[PDB]
Every structure is written in C-alpha cells, then in structure tokens.
Amino acid sequence: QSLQDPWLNALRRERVPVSIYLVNGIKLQGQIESFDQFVILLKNTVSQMVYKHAISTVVPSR
Amino acid sequence: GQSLQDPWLNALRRERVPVSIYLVNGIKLQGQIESFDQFVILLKNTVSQMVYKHAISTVVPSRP
Amino acid sequence: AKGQSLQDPWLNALRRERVPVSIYLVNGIKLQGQIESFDQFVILLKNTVSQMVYKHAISTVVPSRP
Amino acid sequence: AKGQSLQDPWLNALRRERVPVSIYLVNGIKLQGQIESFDQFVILLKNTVSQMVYKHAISTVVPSRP
Amino acid sequence: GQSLQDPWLNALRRERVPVSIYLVNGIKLQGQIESFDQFVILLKNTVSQMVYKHAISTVVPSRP
Amino acid sequence: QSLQDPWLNALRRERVPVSIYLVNGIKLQGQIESFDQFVILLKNTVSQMVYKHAISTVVPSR
Known part of the structure; x- marks a missing residue:
C-alpha cells in the first residue's frame, strides 16, 4: 500500500x-512496465504478467 | 477498479x-484465453479447462 | 469478466x-x-465418497466432456 | 534526432x-x-471507452503532467 | 540524407x-524546440507538447 | 522528383x-533560400521553413 505502490512506481x-x-x-x-493491485507486468525480451502472490522478493539493480 | 490485469487479459482474449x-x-x-473473471481463467486448447489464478505464477503471451 | 461471473456458471453447469x-x-x-456442490471456498466432489476440496488447493479443473 | 527516436520513448513513458x-x-x-497502447499509425486512448485515434488526425499531444 | 530540415531544426534547438x-x-x-525526430517536434513553453509535423504549415524563428 | 527538384533549383x-x-x-x-525533400525555406523580411505537405501551389513572379 503506502510503501509498495510508491516503490514500484519509482522503479517503473x-x-x-x-x-x-x-x-x-x-x-x-x-523492467517494470506497469503494475496494479495484484500483478506486475515485467518486460525483457518478452512482456509477461507476474502475479504478486507468486513473488517472494523484488530486488532492484541500483 | 485500477486494473492492469483486466484490460491486459481482455486484450489477449x-x-x-x-x-x-x-x-x-x-x-x-x-x-488461448477463452474468458476470465476475478478468480479464474478459462484456458482453451484441445480441451477447455478452468485455471485458478492463485495457482498461476506468470502469463506469457506469444506476442504482447 | 468481473467477479464470479465465469466460475459460478461454469461449475454450476458441470454440477x-x-x-x-x-x-x-x-x-x-x-x-x-462429479461436482456435487460448491460454495465460495470449497467444492464437494463425489466419487466413491464425498470429499470437500478447498479451492485454494486446486490448480485446474478439467471436465471429461465439453 | 532521427526516426522514431523521440516519438516512441515519449509516448511509451506516458503509457x-x-x-x-x-x-x-x-x-x-x-x-x-490515458494512452493505452500505440503503434506506427494509431494511438489507443482510454477514457470512458477505448478509442483508436489515427496519428494523421492529431496535431498535438499535451500531457497533463510533465 | 540530403536534409535542410534536420540541420535547420537542430540549429534552432x-x-x-x-x-x-x-x-x-x-x-x-x-x-523553443526541445527536440525533434522524423515525424514530431517537442515544443517547450509553459508545458512540453509533442507536435506532429504533418499538422505544421510553417516554422518561423524569431531570428534565423 | 525529376520535375520538382530542377524547377525549385532554378528558381533558387x-x-x-x-x-x-x-x-x-x-x-x-x-525568395527560395533552399529546400529539400520535405521543406522549402522561404526568405522575405523573415526566413521561414514551409512544409511541402501544406503547400498547394508555387507561382513564380517571372
């Protein structure tokens, strides 16, 4: 919420x-393409939708 | 009500x-995504099966 | 679609x-x-006995016929 | 600059x-x-509905924020 | 690849x-011209707006 | 092309x-100052770049 959204927003x-x-x-x-309450859209050679319930940790490179 | 998931899945469908x-x-x-709602996705191949979103880690379209 | 608009009619048809x-x-x-009954959180599945299956433990439901 | 080197990153950032x-x-x-998507020739613009706008019909795009 | 437009706009920028x-x-x-490419010009005043070249008739610099 | 370029060139x-x-x-x-594939630079009291897509006709005075 008050931490998760602004953090992902700045990364995007x-x-x-x-x-x-x-x-x-x-x-x-x-790269974080976009996200909402339940998913993060991640783009590399492909664009994929990742469910947050399946994620353990998000680690920025820098 | 904010959704990225809804329009992204709807486009694929x-x-x-x-x-x-x-x-x-x-x-x-x-x-192919036949339909979806808040908790499930109906996936169509040789048969039509209901997949619970809670069991899904990632959805990768073969084109975005 | 929104809410339970897919899951409920789909399971109800099978039931x-x-x-x-x-x-x-x-x-x-x-x-x-066979699906005997279901609610928000569980499905009652009938084979030799009737067992309650929690939906959170389910990955996929595959009907034997369309 | 050359080619789409300005238009694409600018629209993508807004998107x-x-x-x-x-x-x-x-x-x-x-x-x-909001810009939902775009390609070479069109922009898909989302308000109460999603409408496809042809770029040839556009004069200017003005973001509400920098 | 012949351009008059490219160096003229680049000078203005x-x-x-x-x-x-x-x-x-x-x-x-x-x-002021902030940047440009093949099809658009980014114009900066109180806000930064993208102008499609196809919508432009003339560009008049207040000095050449 | 084979008409437009040599015609504008002689005017310039x-x-x-x-x-x-x-x-x-x-x-x-x-006066035609210069031109390329997409624009004509026109000079009077000011020097202005005119996009060819906005032009209907160019009429020489003599």
Missing part, C-alpha cells in the same frame, strides 16, 4: 532493472 | 493470442 | 449436468468425480 | 506512467484520456 | 531560438 | 521571387 518511472524472485525459486529479470 | 500459463508448481499450460 | 471432472491440486495430485 | 493526456485533432476537437 | 509554429489549421504555437 | 539559383499558396488559403511571398 526510473526504468530501473529489477530481479523478481518467485516463491518457487525462479528468478525473472526485466 | 479478444485478439485470441496464444499464451503460456506457468503455474507456481512449475507446470506450463498453453492455449 | 447440474453431472459431468465427470478431474481436479488437479497445486501439489500435483489428481482427484476425480 | 507506462498512465499520465492523462489531451490529444488535439487537426480539426480542433480535443480528446482526453 | 541548440541555440534555443524562440520559434512560432503555425499549424495547417491556423493555430499558432510558440516556444 | 536565379533568385526568382515566388508566391507560395498554402492549402489553407494563406499566400506567402519571398
């Missing part, structure tokens, strides 16, 4: 590359 | 884009 | 029509039977 | 950031909404 | 010359 | 005054 605006670790161990990398 | 749905358990389903 | 289904759980177990 | 824009048409009509 | 952009519909915009 | 070289009528009805007058 600044085009900061991120790593998204899923609860199952898979690591995704890309 | 309307334009009948093939997608891959990766489940949290690592299983990959493929097909 | 009324007694279509055999396979219910795949997130852990990979496959359950089979 | 990703869901910045409300005004789109002034060559005939003087003002359209408003 | 680099030297931050105020220009008037007259549109084909008779509307006059004013500001 | 000979310093022939021209009238440029725009599709919207406005008449501009001056």
Whole structure:
C-alpha cells in the first residue's frame, strides 16, 4: 500500500532493472512496465504478467 | 477498479493470442484465453479447462 | 469478466449436468468425480465418497466432456 | 534526432506512467484520456471507452503532467 | 540524407531560438524546440507538447 | 522528383521571387533560400521553413 505502490512506481518511472524472485525459486529479470493491485507486468525480451502472490522478493539493480 | 490485469487479459482474449500459463508448481499450460473473471481463467486448447489464478505464477503471451 | 461471473456458471453447469471432472491440486495430485456442490471456498466432489476440496488447493479443473 | 527516436520513448513513458493526456485533432476537437497502447499509425486512448485515434488526425499531444 | 530540415531544426534547438509554429489549421504555437525526430517536434513553453509535423504549415524563428 | 527538384533549383539559383499558396488559403511571398525533400525555406523580411505537405501551389513572379 503506502510503501509498495510508491516503490514500484519509482522503479517503473526510473526504468530501473529489477530481479523478481518467485516463491518457487525462479528468478525473472526485466523492467517494470506497469503494475496494479495484484500483478506486475515485467518486460525483457518478452512482456509477461507476474502475479504478486507468486513473488517472494523484488530486488532492484541500483 | 485500477486494473492492469483486466484490460491486459481482455486484450489477449479478444485478439485470441496464444499464451503460456506457468503455474507456481512449475507446470506450463498453453492455449488461448477463452474468458476470465476475478478468480479464474478459462484456458482453451484441445480441451477447455478452468485455471485458478492463485495457482498461476506468470502469463506469457506469444506476442504482447 | 468481473467477479464470479465465469466460475459460478461454469461449475454450476458441470454440477447440474453431472459431468465427470478431474481436479488437479497445486501439489500435483489428481482427484476425480462429479461436482456435487460448491460454495465460495470449497467444492464437494463425489466419487466413491464425498470429499470437500478447498479451492485454494486446486490448480485446474478439467471436465471429461465439453 | 532521427526516426522514431523521440516519438516512441515519449509516448511509451506516458503509457507506462498512465499520465492523462489531451490529444488535439487537426480539426480542433480535443480528446482526453490515458494512452493505452500505440503503434506506427494509431494511438489507443482510454477514457470512458477505448478509442483508436489515427496519428494523421492529431496535431498535438499535451500531457497533463510533465 | 540530403536534409535542410534536420540541420535547420537542430540549429534552432541548440541555440534555443524562440520559434512560432503555425499549424495547417491556423493555430499558432510558440516556444523553443526541445527536440525533434522524423515525424514530431517537442515544443517547450509553459508545458512540453509533442507536435506532429504533418499538422505544421510553417516554422518561423524569431531570428534565423 | 525529376520535375520538382530542377524547377525549385532554378528558381533558387536565379533568385526568382515566388508566391507560395498554402492549402489553407494563406499566400506567402519571398525568395527560395533552399529546400529539400520535405521543406522549402522561404526568405522575405523573415526566413521561414514551409512544409511541402501544406503547400498547394508555387507561382513564380517571372
């Protein structure tokens, strides 16, 4: 909410590359294209919709 | 009511884009989005199956 | 679509029509039977016995017939 | 600059950031909404509905915020 | 690749010359050329707006 | 192409005054300073760049 939205918003605006670790161990990398309450759209060579319930952590590269 | 998910899935449905749905358990389903609501997605391939969103990790369209 | 507008009519059709289904759980177990009843959170699945399945444990429901 | 090096990143930034824009048409009509998507020739503009606007009909795009 | 337009606009941009952009519909915009590409000009005044070249009739710099 | 370029080139070289009528009805007058594929630079009391897509006709004075 008061932390999650502004944090992702600044990453999207600044085009900061991120790593998204899923609860199952898979690591995704890309730019945050957009997001809403339940999903984050991540763009690398492809554009994919990631459900937040499957994410463990989002780690910015810088 | 803010949604990115709703119009993104609706576009995929309307334009009948093939997608891959990766489940949290690592299983990959493929097909077209026939319909969806708040909690489920109806995926159509050789058969029509209902997938619970809570079981989904990622949806990858074969074109955006 | 919005809300339960897909899940409820889809499960209700299977229930009324007694279509055999396979219910795949997130852990990979496959359950089979007919949908006897359901509510917001559970599905009652009838095979040799009637068992209550929590929807949160389900990944996919695959009907044996369209 | 050359090619689409200005138009594409500028529209993409507005799209990703869901910045409300005004789109002034060559005939003087003002359209408003958020850029949902765009390609070479059209912009999909979302307000109460999603409408496809041909770029050839547009004179200026004015963002509501920088 | 022959261009008069590219270096002329680039000079105006680099030297931050105020220009008037007259549109084909008779509307006059004013500001400085912030940037441009093949099809658009970004004009800066109180706000920064993208103008499509196809809508422009003439660009008049307040000095050449 | 084979007509437009040599015609404008001779007007520029000979310093022939021209009238440029725009599709919207406005008449501009001056000397052709230069031109390329998409624009003509017209000089009178000011130097202005005119997009060819906005021009209907170019009429030489002599």
